[PDB]
Amino acid sequence: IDSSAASAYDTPLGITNPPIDELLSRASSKYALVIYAAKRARQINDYYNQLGDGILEYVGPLVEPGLQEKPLSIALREIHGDLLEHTEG
Amino acid sequence: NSVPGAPNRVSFAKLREPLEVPGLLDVQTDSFEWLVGSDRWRQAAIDRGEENPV
Amino acid sequence: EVIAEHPVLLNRAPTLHRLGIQAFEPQLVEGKAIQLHPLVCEAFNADFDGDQMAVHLPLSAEAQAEARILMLSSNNILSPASGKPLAMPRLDMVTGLYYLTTLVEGATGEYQAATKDAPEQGVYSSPAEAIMAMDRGALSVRAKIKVRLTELRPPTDLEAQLFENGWKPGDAWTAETTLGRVMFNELLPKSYPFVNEQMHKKVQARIINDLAERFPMIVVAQTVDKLKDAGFYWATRSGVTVSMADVLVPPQKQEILERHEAEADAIERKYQRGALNHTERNESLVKIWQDATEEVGKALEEFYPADNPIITIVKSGATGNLTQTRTLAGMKGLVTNPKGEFIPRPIKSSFREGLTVLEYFINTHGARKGLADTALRTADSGYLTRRLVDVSQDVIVREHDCETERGINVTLAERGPDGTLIRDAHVETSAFARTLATDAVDANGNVIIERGHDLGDPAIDALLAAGITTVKVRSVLTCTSATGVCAMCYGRSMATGKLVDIGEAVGIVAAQSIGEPGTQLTMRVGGLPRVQELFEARVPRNKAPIADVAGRVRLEESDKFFKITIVPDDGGEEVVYDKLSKRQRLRVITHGVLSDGDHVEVGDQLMEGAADPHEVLRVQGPREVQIHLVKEVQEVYRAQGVSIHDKHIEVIVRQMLRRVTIIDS
Amino acid sequence: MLISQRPTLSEETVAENRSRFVIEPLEPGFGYTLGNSLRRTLLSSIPGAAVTSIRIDGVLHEFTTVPGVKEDVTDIILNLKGLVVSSDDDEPVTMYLRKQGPGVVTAGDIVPPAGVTVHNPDMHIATLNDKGKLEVELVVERGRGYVPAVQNKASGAEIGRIPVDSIYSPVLKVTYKVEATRVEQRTDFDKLIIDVETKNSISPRDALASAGGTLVELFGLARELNADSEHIEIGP
Amino acid sequence: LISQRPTLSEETVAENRSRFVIEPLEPGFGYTLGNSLRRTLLSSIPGAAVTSIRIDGVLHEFTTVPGVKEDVTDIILNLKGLVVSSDDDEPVTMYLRKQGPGVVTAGDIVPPAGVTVHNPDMHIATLNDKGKLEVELVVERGRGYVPAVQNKASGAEIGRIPVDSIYSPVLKVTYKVEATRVEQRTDFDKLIIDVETKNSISPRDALASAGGTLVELFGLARELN
Amino acid sequence: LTHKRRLSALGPGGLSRERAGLEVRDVHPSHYGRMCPIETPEGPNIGLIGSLSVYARVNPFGFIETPYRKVENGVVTDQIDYLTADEEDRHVVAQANSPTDENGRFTEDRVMVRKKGGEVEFVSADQVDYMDVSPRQMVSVATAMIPFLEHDDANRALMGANMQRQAVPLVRSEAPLVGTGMELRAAIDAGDVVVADKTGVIEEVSADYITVMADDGTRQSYRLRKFARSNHGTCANQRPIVDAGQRVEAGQVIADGPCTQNGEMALGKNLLVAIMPWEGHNYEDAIILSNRLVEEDVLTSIHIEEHEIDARDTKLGAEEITRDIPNVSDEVLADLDERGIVRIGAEVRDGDILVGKVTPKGETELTPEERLLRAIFGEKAREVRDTSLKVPHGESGKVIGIRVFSREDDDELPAGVNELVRVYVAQKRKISDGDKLAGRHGNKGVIGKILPVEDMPFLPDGTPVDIILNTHGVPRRMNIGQILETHLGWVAKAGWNIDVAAGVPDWASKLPEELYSAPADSTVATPVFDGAQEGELAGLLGSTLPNRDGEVMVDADGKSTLFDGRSGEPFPYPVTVGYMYILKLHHLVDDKIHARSTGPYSMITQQPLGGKAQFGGQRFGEMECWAMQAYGAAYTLQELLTIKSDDTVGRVKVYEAIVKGENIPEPGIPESFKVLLKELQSLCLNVEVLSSDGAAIEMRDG
Amino acid sequence: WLSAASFQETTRVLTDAAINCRSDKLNGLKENVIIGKLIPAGTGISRYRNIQVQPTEEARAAA
Ligand SMILES: [Zn+2]
């Protein structure tokens, strides 16, 4: 059905790789999405900069990262994959 | 024509010029030579009608 | 490695609205100049004649997330002021999309009906065959043909007659169109129905608005990129060039000029005989030469062919006017004095023929006056924008719904000739993007649209079809929220197209939306000074007193002033007014001089001009003064063809009616 | 001279008969020449067979509708122009298509003579009505490219002939695009992307090979003036 | 269907001009062949040009030589119009040296064995009774346009003056089609391409080099399947 | 030349650019022949600055006079009277274009005149008592060099004059094919050209001196400026145009100037132009250039920069110029001579040392780590600080001159200064993307693409075009004069021969007899308000002579059939082609590009400086803050305000976090707020920050 | 008083505020911009600043 499959686009390029509409459907608003992605990226960055010999608490990237992929891109990919949950204040 | 050594540039003008373009830097030189009081300024003032130029 | 997926913010001063700062993904280039996308210029108001831009680099994770989501250029395509798309084909692109989609009669290899000896000629089994035929010079992209399409949706009308269930990809149908329209519809999404129209700029804007309303924004961005590429490709093959031979002059210009010059000579001779004033002669000459200008313009417009390179640019909506075309080839017309007054002697020579010395001198008069006025207008607009921003900044969406039954009455249709209910010309900025406060009920009461429904074009169509002329919407003027406003009262956000998010600064957006079209607000009291005196709650320069009570009207005449006495309809102390300027006119009462013996209303205006909003507030009420302020501001802004939704004006007016004076502490 | 780096060609299947070849890296400015020459050669160089004219029984003077079948003359012509067919002879040959009674006259009902074969026997042509007939005579020739409908070569000796446009080229649609790449701090090299869709009688790779062979023949004819001149050597 | 293969023929217009005719060709095919040949001729024909000069008493480009009417910049601009032919890949050095009044032209440059100058009448400089000119030029080979290479890259001295080098020996290439070839159908093209060079190489050699480059490219296009 | 002829309304005893309304910035009808109504700045000084007209003089009382020819009984005499505005108002002045007979009698009865209050009117031939001298009496020198001025709108003519004043000198100059005749006089009166004083013959001509004999028996020696820096960085060198033995006359031009060819003003180059859209690379006033311009150094200019450094006397000691430079490598000091200055001809890059200076440092307590490192490596710490003169950021070139002044050699240096040295660095700049080109008709634009030669559209002869200009920008700006110039330009670089067979053609009735035939590359003159007409232009387009192949490339309409460079197929429609004279303006990307990550800061408020010359930052003003607030981007705005401008600890913490790879820390308190609080307290205002409890928060952290 | 002083008529506003002994509450766009705090709009409101992000139980177990 054309109406059912109306979300048929070409392959997104670069900074638009996770479609913004799907991410907006994942979250409540756009600001909630912004804070969601920023906090997940901070958690990933802290995981990468972990001492290793101390205490491990922050979970690593739940999806397989690229070669030199930014933590924010990984956070957005995790959000798009329904691998995280958030609660607003 | 007036300039001794000039390249040939044909013109589309159809009107004769009764008066040629004056010196384009006279607005400064004439004023300063009036200020100093040079001889040529004195002669120009005398030939234009003068009483006692200063 | 380090710049990959790291957005940067680009800004061009002055920053008039939000779209003056936009986030982009950078790519290294070998030059020293920033390469900017051609479709983001209108948002930046940028042209490539020496402009410069500033680049800023976000650092923290929150900053990069905001740059990617909130401020990305691919997410901001619609204006936050009117909702019209800004990242749409303009200038060269339009020309291409025009030349591609126009239909030419008698072109090469066009469709021909079957004869008694030969079958139909010009029918192709696929667009690939049409392309293979046009590559051999046997076909034109602007020739009508019949082509079998299998990957393009029927235009919503043939689909309901050919495919009973529906159209699925691969189903073949025969379309009578041009190859250019087939290519253009190949640019559009697959589920979008076939258009089959010539792409004027209005048509392209309508299509892009439809895509934005019906499709995800990523699809809209990709479609806009495809349209840009196709328009750029077909603009260079459109054959639009400027030549002295393409600037044609009408052959009957001399006759019109001679006749009007004979009339002018007759008027001048009559003036020399003493039977004329100076003002009368000036007015007669101005009228004569204006009529001559109109005649020359009409003759030029009718003389030019439809495929002229000069006419094509104007007609396609790319850029330009017909007045500029008339000035280029035709008659310059009447010019103004240095103090703003028409000169009786016109400029009868066009810039193609070449102005003379004195005509050029007068043209310099007018041109320098305009150039010098532009800078002052820009400075005044900037000051007004700063004041508006500094006023409405505590107006922020704090809740979702204040649960209020109070609203604003908005009119959709006024009378209708015999009951057709002709739609109001200003319903897109008065009734769209608003939520109904009460259920719509017509004669033989039946709920058409329920409470809380976001009004759109289908909703307005349904309401008009049901015979409903007025509705009650929710506005920020009547909102019972403690701090800030709520999302339901503000309504749809003109940028996203959905309900406004909680926590958005709508005051800053409203102030910027009002203040951005200030440079193009030419004064004709009117223009920018009228807006400034409306927003400052000042008494008007040409103040027109309004009636204080309704009833009998008594007129008293004298020298240098008039006098109006309002005898109460039910008795009481008759209201007496004061001296009035003679260089003004009384209000026209329908068919119209207000001599005497009239029954004025409670707040009926008497003279012609502007009434001070303070008297409107004191006599009638806060709702009436809100209506007056919004209507006056919109009247000023609509004289220049500027579309601003009423919600911004309503926010600003709401911030002006927040206080009461204490008299009995 | 020696090129900085040898160009490479890679295929990318998109459909049953559709491919997207990529050639990279290319010296700056060679992408456009290569792409345009390859596109023109693919579209107008490969020989092939196609239906040249048709003759429908029962339709002699008025070419509007055919009795006994739902489709009209135009629909039959459009269906027949989509018939892919390979041939062995060069001179024109005649084929027959006879159907009796109601039913769908698919392309498989055509009886192929010696040396002629069809590759899409499941192509819909017409739908006869109850107690209906259809006898169509086709003329198949061999050529290259796309030639418009040649008018009747007689003053009325044969009147039932219906000339049609001949799609001789096995390749249906070619589009070339040139992008920019980078090798080593040199972001000016060109990359050529050719999207080619052909019929089912040939594969896009074979079409590309034939086009390359013909272009090599042409430019070797140009080169034969001086075979020992100084040109750019690609390498291995 | 035509079984006749295309053929190429040559006619001579001048000493450095020629006109080549290719026929028959398929309809709509002459323009693309002509454009491919024109682009290859204007882009990828190897040649020789000077890459550096060193004058006796000067240290940089922005100076003047005593007794010479033209400063160093004008001398370089004049030298950039030389047409030179070298048969050696590695750089070679030519010497120019004149004294006293006269007109220093390109005919006063004595080149080594294997290097030739094809215009020994172009104007380089003019010297009075007190003017002496002594320069040495470095001639290399290449193709296309290469901007000057600075001395900080090759580690040269201060007196060396790098010069932009244009190695392309082709002046002007154009083409036209006739679409008049007839065998049984009257819609077959005929390409006519006019080539004019800088007298360094004959137009036949330039056309052969372009054909070789295009053969290599379109052969790698088909062999890698 | 225009600077010396400028009339300014600003200064002591004059108006100010803010206290001046829309009353003095107007073209008064009394400016005719005294002040140019076209040439004025288009910025905030519009109407407050102007230029003298060509024929305008100055009264002894300070009023501006203009000449007029006195006419009597309809006969125009040869007596010229200089009148001011007051004297002009009393009389009625005719127009210089009025048709006159052989004696001066007006052939036509009705004459266009100007009455008292401007009042352009028609009167009889007997009322006239004065006439103008030339049709271009109202225009200035810059405005008189625009061909087809009457076909351009006032705004575009203003822009054209202003941009024509901004051209840069190229390495080689070329006079325009189509001009106005105000090129010899402007160049000669400018003074940058060298003019012989007395008639005679040339004896010795060189690149830097010319010796001229005379009939009197006196030798005149002229020294020519060679590669001399002007006030704005351009190169101003003169070259002789005479030969030994040539006999010159008093007043004849003897050596050209920077923008001068054969004594005529030459500010730009003649380029083959095609008027057409092209793939969007010339979208929105952009320009596409051919690569032949870069290869052949057509639009190439020399720019000279001067760097000066002085070694003075300080209180802690004396400053010495030497090649010691305590803490550097050894290869940095390779281009410096024995006295510590660079060598002439040595190429310098960004950051290279030009003059090696050093200053006394005094006693400073070194860090223990630095002391240990110096002990390990043996580098003794010397009490001198390196203050060498280094090439600024984004600059390079070649050293062409060194000037040294020393007090010990009796040089009039200022007090305290002991030594001074100046270094001149010269750079040749080619045309590139982002450079601004313009024309004489107000058409400007930055180069957006430089295509190869084989990608440009070419004529059927094979000649590529040099520049592509967009079509959509011409009609809506009312400056179609350029188009006419384009057509005329082609004829100028084509030669023409009017077929006088069967009599003179009707359209060529008023053409002078010397314009009936011209050779190739000939130059023509089109005076401002009296020049070529449209009918004559069409006739000359139809009468052009063929090329070397005997064929015509441009038809009578001024259009040609161009081919596509990158496709080969001819364009479906003919395209307007011709020759246009374009100018390279002094707005180059090399002087515009600037970027910074961290640099110098201010003193009172710890905010970054501003300007390219100081490695400053970009201002994020109040409007940008409004845009960020409307977007809803709280964090971006907060970080921009705090940790990029004022947070003193935050800046270094952010840099350390970025380098080490951790997260960006939270912002602190901007220093400007604390400065504001101190400034408020100094006004006897008790400003105090209160916490949630109600106490006072001290701002003395540290 | 901070926004009023930043807007226009600084001296009069400061005099009136000093005499009245006014106390700014520091909740608005202009004041928060001046002092360096997050503006109370967009992503700077309490609802969006206090988002708690954590992996879901299924993703936690899978990883
Ligand atoms: Zn509400």
mmCIF file of C-alpha atoms in Angstrom, chain F residues 185-261:
data_model
loop_
_atom_site.group_PDB
_atom_site.id
_atom_site.type_symbol
_atom_site.label_atom_id
_atom_site.label_comp_id
_atom_site.label_asym_id
_atom_site.label_seq_id
_atom_site.Cartn_x
_atom_site.Cartn_y
_atom_site.Cartn_z
ATOM 1 C CA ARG F 185 43.433 63.497 -19.805
ATOM 2 C CA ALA F 186 42.701 61.570 -16.604
ATOM 3 C CA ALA F 187 45.983 59.644 -16.748
ATOM 4 C CA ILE F 188 48.047 62.720 -17.639
ATOM 5 C CA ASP F 189 46.485 64.915 -14.944
ATOM 6 C CA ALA F 190 46.749 62.114 -12.373
ATOM 7 C CA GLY F 191 50.535 62.526 -12.386
ATOM 8 C CA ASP F 192 51.591 58.873 -12.111
ATOM 9 C CA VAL F 193 52.727 59.043 -15.758
ATOM 10 C CA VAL F 194 56.070 60.560 -16.779
ATOM 11 C CA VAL F 195 55.825 63.468 -19.225
ATOM 12 C CA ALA F 196 58.665 65.087 -21.155
ATOM 13 C CA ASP F 197 59.310 68.702 -20.178
ATOM 14 C CA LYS F 198 61.104 70.036 -23.274
ATOM 15 C CA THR F 199 61.192 68.812 -26.858
ATOM 16 C CA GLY F 200 64.230 66.851 -27.971
ATOM 17 C CA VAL F 201 65.559 63.367 -28.653
ATOM 18 C CA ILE F 202 66.184 60.358 -26.428
ATOM 19 C CA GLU F 203 69.832 59.534 -25.705
ATOM 20 C CA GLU F 204 69.759 56.664 -23.188
ATOM 21 C CA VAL F 205 66.635 54.715 -22.224
ATOM 22 C CA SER F 206 66.807 52.109 -19.462
ATOM 23 C CA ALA F 207 64.465 50.438 -16.993
ATOM 24 C CA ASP F 208 65.149 53.068 -14.315
ATOM 25 C CA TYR F 209 66.322 56.264 -16.049
ATOM 26 C CA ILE F 210 65.670 58.192 -19.263
ATOM 27 C CA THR F 211 68.002 60.851 -20.678
ATOM 28 C CA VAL F 212 66.512 63.424 -23.059
ATOM 29 C CA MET F 213 68.452 65.908 -25.172
ATOM 30 C CA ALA F 214 66.927 69.199 -26.306
ATOM 31 C CA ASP F 215 67.238 71.710 -29.121
ATOM 32 C CA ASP F 216 68.339 74.249 -26.505
ATOM 33 C CA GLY F 217 71.249 72.006 -25.520
ATOM 34 C CA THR F 218 70.144 70.846 -22.072
ATOM 35 C CA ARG F 219 69.956 67.258 -20.815
ATOM 36 C CA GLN F 220 66.969 66.161 -18.725
ATOM 37 C CA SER F 221 67.283 63.016 -16.604
ATOM 38 C CA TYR F 222 64.137 61.233 -15.406
ATOM 39 C CA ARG F 223 64.276 58.546 -12.715
ATOM 40 C CA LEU F 224 61.512 55.940 -12.867
ATOM 41 C CA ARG F 225 59.941 54.384 -9.788
ATOM 42 C CA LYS F 226 60.422 50.605 -9.848
ATOM 43 C CA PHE F 227 58.433 48.301 -7.547
ATOM 44 C CA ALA F 228 57.506 50.995 -5.038
ATOM 45 C CA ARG F 229 54.825 50.291 -2.448
ATOM 46 C CA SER F 230 51.829 52.618 -2.527
ATOM 47 C CA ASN F 231 49.779 53.664 0.502
ATOM 48 C CA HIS F 232 47.479 50.643 0.079
ATOM 49 C CA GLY F 233 50.034 47.906 -0.640
ATOM 50 C CA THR F 234 49.760 47.802 -4.427
ATOM 51 C CA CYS F 235 52.812 47.916 -6.685
ATOM 52 C CA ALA F 236 53.483 51.228 -8.458
ATOM 53 C CA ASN F 237 56.275 50.882 -11.024
ATOM 54 C CA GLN F 238 56.836 52.867 -14.215
ATOM 55 C CA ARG F 239 58.146 51.585 -17.540
ATOM 56 C CA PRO F 240 59.465 53.552 -20.531
ATOM 57 C CA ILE F 241 57.594 53.522 -23.832
ATOM 58 C CA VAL F 242 60.250 55.309 -25.900
ATOM 59 C CA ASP F 243 63.352 54.204 -27.792
ATOM 60 C CA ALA F 244 66.807 55.678 -28.266
ATOM 61 C CA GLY F 245 66.878 58.184 -31.111
ATOM 62 C CA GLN F 246 63.139 58.877 -30.989
ATOM 63 C CA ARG F 247 62.260 62.576 -31.095
ATOM 64 C CA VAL F 248 59.696 63.610 -28.483
ATOM 65 C CA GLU F 249 57.715 66.804 -27.906
ATOM 66 C CA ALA F 250 57.087 68.880 -24.802
ATOM 67 C CA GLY F 251 54.099 67.279 -23.092
ATOM 68 C CA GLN F 252 54.416 63.869 -24.754
ATOM 69 C CA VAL F 253 54.086 60.869 -22.445
ATOM 70 C CA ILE F 254 57.486 59.245 -21.970
ATOM 71 C CA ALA F 255 56.878 56.431 -19.433
ATOM 72 C CA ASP F 256 53.658 54.703 -18.405
ATOM 73 C CA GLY F 257 52.438 54.407 -14.836
ATOM 74 C CA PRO F 258 50.844 51.555 -12.883
ATOM 75 C CA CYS F 259 47.406 51.560 -14.542
ATOM 76 C CA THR F 260 48.500 53.150 -17.806
ATOM 77 C CA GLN F 261 49.134 51.913 -21.345
#
